[PDB]
Amino acid sequence: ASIAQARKLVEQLKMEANIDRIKVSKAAADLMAYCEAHAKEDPLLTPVPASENPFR
Amino acid sequence: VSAEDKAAAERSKMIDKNLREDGEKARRTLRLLLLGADNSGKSTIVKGIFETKFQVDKVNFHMFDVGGQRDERRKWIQCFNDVTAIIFVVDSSDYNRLQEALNDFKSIWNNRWLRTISVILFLNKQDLLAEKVLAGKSKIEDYFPEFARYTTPEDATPEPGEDPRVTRAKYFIRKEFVDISTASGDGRHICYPHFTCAVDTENARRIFNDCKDIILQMNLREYNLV
Amino acid sequence: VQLVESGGGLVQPGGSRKLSCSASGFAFSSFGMHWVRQAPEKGLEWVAYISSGSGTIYYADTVKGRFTISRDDPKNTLFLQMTSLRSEDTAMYYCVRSIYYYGSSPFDFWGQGTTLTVSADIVMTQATSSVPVTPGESVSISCRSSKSLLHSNGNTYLYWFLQRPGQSPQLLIYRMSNLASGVPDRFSGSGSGTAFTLTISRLEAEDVGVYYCMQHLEYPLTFGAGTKLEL
Amino acid sequence: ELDQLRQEAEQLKNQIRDARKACADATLSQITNNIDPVGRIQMRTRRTLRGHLAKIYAMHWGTDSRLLVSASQDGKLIIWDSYTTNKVHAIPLRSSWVMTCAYAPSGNYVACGGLDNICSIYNLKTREGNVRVSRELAGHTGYLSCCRFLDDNQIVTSSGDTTCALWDIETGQQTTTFTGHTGDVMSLSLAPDTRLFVSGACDASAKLWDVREGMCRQTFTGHESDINAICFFPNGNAFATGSDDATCRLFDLRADQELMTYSHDNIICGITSVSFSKSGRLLLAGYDDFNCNVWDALKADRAGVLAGHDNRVSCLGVTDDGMAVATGSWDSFLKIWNGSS
Amino acid sequence: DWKSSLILMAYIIIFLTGLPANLLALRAFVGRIRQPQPAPVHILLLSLTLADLLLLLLLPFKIIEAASNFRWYLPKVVCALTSFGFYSSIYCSTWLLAGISIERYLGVAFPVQYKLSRRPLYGVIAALVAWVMSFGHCTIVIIVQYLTCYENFTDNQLDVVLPVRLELCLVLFFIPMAVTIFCYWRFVWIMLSQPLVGAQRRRRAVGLAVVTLLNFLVCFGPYNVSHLVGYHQRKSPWWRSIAVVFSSLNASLDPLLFYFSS
Ligand SMILES: Cc1noc(C)c1-c1ccc(C(=O)N2[C@@H](c3ccccc3Cl)SC[C@H]2C(=O)O)cc1
Ligand SMILES: Cc1nc(N2C[C@@H](C)O[C@@H](C)C2)c2[nH]c(N)c(S(=O)(=O)c3ccccc3F)c2n1
Ligand SMILES: CC(C)CCC[C@@H](C)[C@H]1CC[C@H]2[C@@H]3CC=C4C[C@@H](O)CC[C@]4(C)[C@H]3CC[C@]12C
Ligand SMILES: CCCCCCCCCCCCCCCC(=O)O
């Protein structure tokens, strides 16, 4: 029983280990590009004028 | 506002009126929380959520035994932050599992959310504890070294006609729980210890009296008098 | 959901009569209720309205004082006490429902109707009244209000209803753009604040009927004379 | 047998750690240093949706970004109209012990759950004009902590029984179950594409699941306490967690590791809710210190404080168009926050 | 003179000690009212702070009256409005303190019933009753008056002012004083009879109740005693100017006992 209980954990760890991992720098650059590319469409980072604000 | 926005506002006002009526109806019942172990006997006290409704002195009580979820009483105890009190039923006859009960009471008392919720502690299975003390086969000194040097304090209240040994054991257990309770809280919430014989019919009366005291303390706090 | 109305017969002029609307199959206590009359060979005319809880009551200028609307929520029935019956009250009275909340479909279910025979308003204008249309082709009806029905909230409050011959009117569009549930996709609403158009992509034998456009924006509730579609 | 398996597991964990260290060529904090700071985010309470009579634990915005549903111990599930502060509906729940609520993407259905271990799906658009429970999804042995809609027919729920489940509303049975957590799952966030989702449990870990495959893809162990809330980056390639140790974290599904930690020495209380802005540059985060803090997701600099609540902030959500932020607290209030220009 | 200088010093000290404290208490009580399910005592406290603030706003007029020794005063309209407002706020505060005493006694003699059955409507009605009993009485008096700023009264006016003062004592103070004394005596005795399971600061509350009762009897006591003294002597007492100082001292001492006690 414990053998199958641990065997499952070992199989899950093997499945998680054998995955494609890109560099952290590339992921950070992608996140920065997404944040800087939708900045004008963000009504919280860049507040909209009170005319277009629906909660005025 | 338009004609269909005025009607929507009227509907919202009706919804708010119904909500206020429901809140007024539901504010008239005092909510509790049943806590304990498997052997505590929490179910047979008043004689996933298993709600229990009982009424004493024309006051409605709602005891919420949260069975089902089966681990530490954690991450769902935040919901029971507005309860009037917490009934912590503990089996005082089984010394082997006693330390687990004290640890559980310490964990419940020192909870970040139940920092204002008084605990009504019931020392269940009083007759079994008395029988165990009278038999002498099981000694509390084996599990609790501090019991060897413990004696019954003077000016006590041994109202039942019982042997000093049983009274000493009961007072030792109650003292342990009270010392756990008084190590924190700073008087914001207090623990009310009671003794239950598993056949007593006055548990509801004790709960009502303790809830009356708790509500009096809350009213005191509401007046900036405390 | 089914509204059945009874209590309308032959009444001498100057008399009194009461109409009863029996509501079943829906939460009558949460629905605002209207009364809509339709004179023979004439268009729909709004009569009275009572909201949920009987908070606000609005009557037409041609019935104020003579007629009164009341609702018996516990027994699910709507009533109109019609007094001083003039000979202009000789029309079928319908009992339409209307729940009002963001996204509601007001005027959704119209009652069956009861024929009573008495022995500052936005004027909607459905120019055409007769349209010879053959099944398969697209037809566009067209109303035109006096006041712009586009409130500041952004909602253009114009409703489009179709009455099949010998049937109670059924809402096709709510707030002009919206399409009512149980309504075929081909009917569509295109709108401008003073000009409103209803288009059916494919004609059907069921589709032919008289189409009526109403404004819910100011209290007096007007309906355009309507445009009968001839097969 | 058991000994070898316990070891093999340790060596696999060591291999995963070594791979993560190798892939960490740099860090997000040092990469995003030349960008101009967002400044000071000033937000004012546009609306105060009052009417709840007990502490709120959940809210969810509609896809139209105007209707929101809130859940509380009062026993009601109000469907607010945020623009005009109107109660469109007030659904009385059978169990007042509700800690979660959801709004369907189509807007036709809502869901609720809690200590009753049952997900109740309510049909808002009914011909009868009332809100009635269309389906009660039973089958979980623990309290429901979060429920999210995939579509009108599928809903994923997380419970305190260390499992997450994918339900079929039409049938009422778990289409797929998600096992692997060793603690009470306290939150879940569905990806923009709803093909993947993450769950934050009390074992201080976050697991990335697949709704179709039904197997965990990656795990993220960077916290020290229970993860009370989890969100998802708008692009779907990252997510943010909020734990009880007063620190948020930004994990990435591709680098498989935490990028930056959102912590301050002044804040010692745990995070209860986390949501990103529409662009993802801002990270709203509720806290038990009666305050909500806006974190610059690229620099970990607190860009503002949404201090308007008299009790613990429990729920928090940003509109789909990013036009507003609604925060619910235990003081039975619900405030809509919007920036001022 | 020495007496006028002392009165002015007491007035300015009272105003400076009260206005910021009363403003803070008003803000806190407004915030509490906006919170869900306010208690009647909270509405009564809000009304008491409003009455205290109204009294404090007209304190500068009493300061300039003391400075000018009644010799140099603004027109009759300003004096008649300010004296009416001051003397009506005094009795409004008296009746609101009487209402707060009733609420405190109710919340201790019947704890469970008070917690269950309380509604903000009771506090609103109590505040309205206090406001009526003070402002309407003062309005009736000022109306009968019209149909030194009320310092010197002739013999003809004396026969009208003295019985009205007797009424404004026996009906506007002796009833609130009696109910406050009874409520606080019962509060203290019930609290002393309570065997609090643990030490939850139930002696500090008894001390605070005794202090509040003493504050009531010291602030609103001599003022209304002066009415009986003047009626017996058939002449307005000369120490009314110094009794109203003690009466206004309560407007500054109220936030200390009701808000800053904790
Ligand atoms: C009536 C009448 N007719 O002629 C006369 C003279 C009166 C008359 C005037 C004054 C009083 C009188 O003693 N008051 C009233 C008062 C005083 C000053 C400003 C406003 C008001 Cl209301 S209220 C408080 C009381 C007080 O001074 O403490 C009694 C009777
Ligand atoms: C009928 C009534 N009158 C009240 N006031 C008192 C004064 C301050 O104002 C006037 C207008 C009347 C009440 N105030 C409060 N707190 C209550 S009660 O419902 O809580 C309650 C009910 C039964 C037993 C004890 C109680 F505490 C209550 N009830
Ligand atoms: C008597 C004079 C000095 C003061 C009069 C002020 C009174 C009449 C006013 C001021 C503020 C008002 C309160 C402010 C708002 C609330 C909260 C609501 O849930 C119940 C009514 C209640 C409690 C109002 C009752 C009336 C009120 C107390
Ligand atoms: C300034 C206002 C003074 C008026 C005083 C009226 C107080 C009314 C008190 C009624 C409360 C109910 C009394 C106890 C009821 C019971 O016996 O349980």
What is the residue-wise DSSP string for E3-26?
HHHHHHHHHHHHHHHHHHHHHHHH
Ligand 2 atom closest to residue E102's alpha carbon, by position in its atom list? 8
Contacts with E144 (C-beta within 8 Å, 6 or more apart), sequence order? E160, E164
Contacts with D125 (C-beta within 8 Å, 6 or more apart), sequence order? C181, D107, D108
- Give the C-alpha distances (Å, rounded to integers) separating C26 from C55, C99, D43, D129: 20, 11, 43, 6
* DSSP label of C74: G
Set of chain D residues whose Cβ sits within 8 Å of the Cβ of E36: 50, 52-53, 331-333
Tokens of C34: 């209207």
E101 residue type, one letter? S
Residue with tokens 């101009």: D36
Q: What angle do CA E255, E258, E261 make, to 5 degrees?
A: 90
Residues E223/E237, Cβ–Cβ less than 8 Å: no
Tokens of E66: 């003391």
Question: Which phi and psi angles does E153 have, rounded to 5°?
Answer: -120, 135
Q: Write the CATH number for D194.
A: 2.130.10.10
Which residue of chain C is at minimal alpha-carbon distance from D80? C102
Q: Quote the radius of gyration of chain B (alpha carbons, Å).
A: 21
Residues B225/E209, Cβ–Cβ less than 8 Å: yes
* DSSP label of E135: I
Q: Which residues pair with D80 in a beta bridge?
A: D68, D87
Residues C48/C63, Cβ–Cβ less than 8 Å: yes
Helical (H) or strand (E) element with D162:
none
Length of chain B in residues, anyone? 226
**Whether A and B touch (3+ CB pairs < 8 Å), yes or no:** no
Backbone dihedral region for residue E74 (phi beyond 0: left; psi -120 to 50: alpha; all else: beta): beta
Residue with tokens 């038990």: D288
Set of chain B residues whose Cβ sits within 8 Å of the Cβ of C217: 2-3
C117 residue type, one letter? T
Taking Cα atoms as reference points, which of E245, E189, E195 lies closest to residue E220? E245
Query: DSSP string spanning B109-131?
Result: HT-SSTTS-EEEEEEE-HHHHHH
What is the number of other CB atoms lying within 10 angstroms of the CB of residue D87? 24
Tokens of B32: 């509790």
Structural domain of D83:
43-339
Backbone dihedral region for residue B198 (phi beyond 0: left; psi -120 to 50: alpha; all else: beta): left
Contacts with C42 (C-beta within 8 Å, 6 or more apart), sequence order? C91
Q: What angle do CA D213, D217, D222 make, to 5 degrees?
A: 150
CA D336 to chain centre: 18
- Classify domain B3-223 at the CATH topology level: Rossmann fold (3.40.50)
E144 lines ligand 1 (CB under 6 A): yes
* DSSP label of D215: S
Taking Cα atoms as reference points, which of D163, D123, D157, D160 lies closest to residue D137? D157
* DSSP label of B79: G
Q: What angle do CA C205, C207, C211 make, to 5 degrees?
A: 140
Is the C-alpha dihedral spanning D48, D52, D56, D58 positive or negative? negative
Tokens of A33: 């590009």
Q: Which CATH architecture has domain C2-118?
A: Sandwich (2.60)
Q: Is D16 a domain residue?
A: no
Q: Which residues pair with D45 in a beta bridge?
A: D337
* Separation between Cα atoms, residue B47 and residue B204, nearest integer Å: 9
* DSSP label of D236: S
Q: Does domain C130-225 have CATH number 1.20.120.1200?
A: no
Taking Cα atoms as reference points, which of A27, A30, A38 lies closest to residue D279? A38
Helical (H) or strand (E) element with D12:
helix D2-23
* DSSP label of C156: B
Q: Looking at chain A, which subunits does it touch, using at least 3 CB pairs closer than 8 Å as the criterion?
A: D
Q: How far is the CA of E42 from the centre of ligand 3 (A)?
A: 10
* Separation between Cα atoms, residue B152 and residue E66, nearest integer Å: 70
Tokens of A12: 């899950």
Tokens of D328: 């619910």
Taking Cα atoms as reference points, which of E214, E172, E210 lies closest to residue E191? E210
Residues E96/E130, Cβ–Cβ less than 8 Å: yes
CB contact under 8 A, B5 and C219: no
Mutant choice from E27, E32, E34 vs D, greatest count of D C-beta within 10 A: E34
Structural domain of A29:
3-55
User: Beta strand D325-329 with D313-318: parallel, antiparallel or unpaired?
Assistant: antiparallel
Of B24, B187, B224, nearest to E261 by CB-CB distance is B224
Strand order in the sheet with D206-210: D185-190, D196-201, D206-210, D216-220
Helical (H) or strand (E) element with D314:
strand D313-318
Burial class (CB in 10 A: 0-12, 13-18, 19+), E219: buried
- Give the C-alpha distances (Å, rounded to integers) separating D136 from D59, D112, D118, D184, D187: 20, 10, 6, 21, 20
- Give the C-alpha distances (Å, rounded to integers) separating E245 from B46, D310, E4, E131: 59, 38, 11, 22
Contacts with D11 (C-beta within 8 Å, 6 or more apart), sequence order? none
Query: DSSP string spanning chain A?
Result: -HHHHHHHHHHHHHHHHSS----HHHHHHHHHHHHHHSGGG-TTTTTPPTTT-TT-
E98 lines ligand 4 (CB under 6 A): yes
For residue E114, the SS3 value is helix
For residue B190, the SS3 value is coil
Residue with tokens 């501090």: B146
Of A6, A41, A49, nearest to D5 by CB-CB distance is A6
Distance from CA of D7 to the nearest CA of B (A): 28
Q: What angle do CA D113, D116, D119 make, to 5 degrees?
A: 35
CB of D74 within 8 Å of a chain E CB? The answer is no
- Give the C-alpha distances (Å, rounded to integers) separating D226 from D247, D260, D266, D270, E247: 11, 18, 20, 9, 58
Tokens of C119: 């022995």
For residue B176, the SS3 value is helix
E118 lines ligand 2 (CB under 6 A): yes
E110 lines ligand 2 (CB under 6 A): yes
Taking Cα atoms as reference points, which of E55, E60, E40, E49 lies closest to residue E22? E49
Taking Cα atoms as reference points, which of E219, E203, E201, E221 lies closest to residue E256? E219
CB contact under 8 A, C218 and B14: no
Question: What is the number of domains present in chain A?
Answer: 1
Residue with tokens 């239950």: B196
Question: Which phi and psi angles does E72 have, rounded to 5°?
Answer: -130, 105
What is the number of other CB atoms lying within 10 angstroms of the CB of residue C3? 24
B48 residue type, one letter? G
Q: Write the CATH number for E161.
A: 1.20.1070.10
* Separation between Cα atoms, residue E234 and residue A36, nearest integer Å: 87
Residues C140/C34, Cβ–Cβ less than 8 Å: no
Q: Which residues pair with D339 in a beta bridge?
A: D43
CB pairs under 8 A between A and D: 168
Is the C-alpha dihedral spanning E225, E229, E230, E235 positive or negative? negative
Question: What is the number of domains present in chain D?
Answer: 1
Burial class (CB in 10 A: 0-12, 13-18, 19+), A14: middle
Residues B142/B113, Cβ–Cβ less than 8 Å: no
Residues C140/C199, Cβ–Cβ less than 8 Å: yes
Question: Which phi and psi angles does B11 have, rounded to 5°?
Answer: -65, -40
Residues D299/D283, Cβ–Cβ less than 8 Å: no
For residue C103, the SS3 value is coil
Question: Which phi and psi angles does D167 have, rounded to 5°?
Answer: -105, 160
Length of chain A in residues, anyone? 56
Taking Cα atoms as reference points, which of D106, D138, D140 lies closest to residue D123? D106
E85 lines ligand 2 (CB under 6 A): no
Set of chain E residues whose Cβ sits within 8 Å of the Cβ of B218: 115
Orientation angle between helical segments E240-258 and E204-219, nearest 10 degrees: 160
D328 residue type, one letter? G
D41 residue type, one letter? I
Q: Write the CATH number for A30.
A: 4.10.260.10
Strand order in the sheet with D257-262: D227-230, D238-243, D248-252, D257-262
Residues D110/D101, Cβ–Cβ less than 8 Å: yes
Residues B85/B211, Cβ–Cβ less than 8 Å: yes
Q: How far is the CA of E30 from the centre of ligand 3 (A)?
A: 10
Q: Is D199 a domain residue?
A: yes
Q: Is D2 a domain residue?
A: no
For residue E260, the SS3 value is coil
Residue with tokens 């079929």: D168
Ligand 4 atom closest to residue E110's alpha carbon, by position in its atom list? 18
* Separation between Cα atoms, residue E15 and residue E37, nearest integer Å: 33
CB pairs under 8 A between B and E: 74
* Separation between Cα atoms, residue D256 and residue D269, nearest integer Å: 27
End-to-end CA distance of chain D: 66
* Separation between Cα atoms, residue C5 and residue C3, nearest integer Å: 7
Helical (H) or strand (E) element with B220:
helix B203-222
> Where do the H-state alpha helices sit in E110-173?
111-117, 120-131, 137-146, 155-170
Backbone dihedral region for residue E37 (phi beyond 0: left; psi -120 to 50: alpha; all else: beta): left
CB contact under 8 A, C30 and D129: yes
User: Beta strand D248-252 with D163-168: parallel, antiparallel or unpaired?
Assistant: unpaired
CB contact under 8 A, B187 and E259: no
Question: What is the number of domains present in chain E?
Answer: 1
Helical (H) or strand (E) element with B143:
helix B140-143
Tokens of B164: 């000093």
Domain with CATH 2.60.40.10 in chain C: 2-118, 130-225
Q: How far is the CA of D90 from the centre of ligand 1 (A)?
A: 56
* Separation between Cα atoms, residue A3 and residue A9, nearest integer Å: 10
What is the number of other CB atoms lying within 10 angstroms of the CB of residue C50? 22
CB of D202 within 8 Å of a chain B CB? The answer is yes
**Resolution, Å (one decimal):** 3.1
Question: Which phi and psi angles does B111 have, rounded to 5°?
Answer: -65, 145
Residues D204/D220, Cβ–Cβ less than 8 Å: no
Is the C-alpha dihedral spanning E27, E30, E32, E35 positive or negative? negative
Mutant choice from C34, C58, C101, C174 vs B, greatest count of B C-beta within 10 A: C101
Tokens of E238: 């000369």
* Separation between Cα atoms, residue E228 and residue E237, nearest integer Å: 10
* Separation between Cα atoms, residue A17 and residue D15, nearest integer Å: 7
Helical (H) or strand (E) element with D144:
strand D144-149
CB of B10 within 8 Å of a chain C CB? The answer is yes
Strand order in the sheet with D132-138: D98-103, D109-114, D118-123, D132-138
- Give the C-alpha distances (Å, rounded to integers) separating E142 from C34, D47, E227: 55, 45, 17
Q: Where are the beta strands (DSSP E) in C124-215?
A: 130-132, 139-144, 158-163, 170-174, 178-179, 187-191, 195-200, 210-215
Q: Is D121 a domain residue?
A: yes
Tokens of C139: 């037809």
Taking Cα atoms as reference points, which of E44, C173, D321, C154 lies closest to residue B223? E44
* Separation between Cα atoms, residue C34 and residue C57, nearest integer Å: 10
Q: How far is the CA of D202 from the centre of ligand 4 (A)?
A: 51
Structural domain of E183:
2-258
Tell me the best of E134, E138, E147, E164 to mutate to test the pocket of ligand 1, counting ligand atoms within 8 Å of each CB and taking the most.
E164
Helical (H) or strand (E) element with B11:
helix B3-26
Residues C101/C52, Cβ–Cβ less than 8 Å: no
E125, E130, E131, E137: CA torsion to nearest 10? 130
Distance from CA of B112 to the nearest CA of D (A): 11
Q: Is D307 a domain residue?
A: yes
What is the number of other CB atoms lying within 10 angstroms of the CB of residue D201? 27
Tokens of E208: 């605070």
* Separation between Cα atoms, residue C88 and residue C71, nearest integer Å: 24
Residue with tokens 């020794």: E69
For residue D201, the SS3 value is strand
Taking Cα atoms as reference points, which of C115, C110, C82 lies closest to residue C98? C110
Tokens of E33: 């009212």
* Separation between Cα atoms, residue D125 and residue C103, nearest integer Å: 10
Residues E70/E79, Cβ–Cβ less than 8 Å: no
Q: Quote the radius of gyration of chain A (alpha carbons, Å).
A: 23
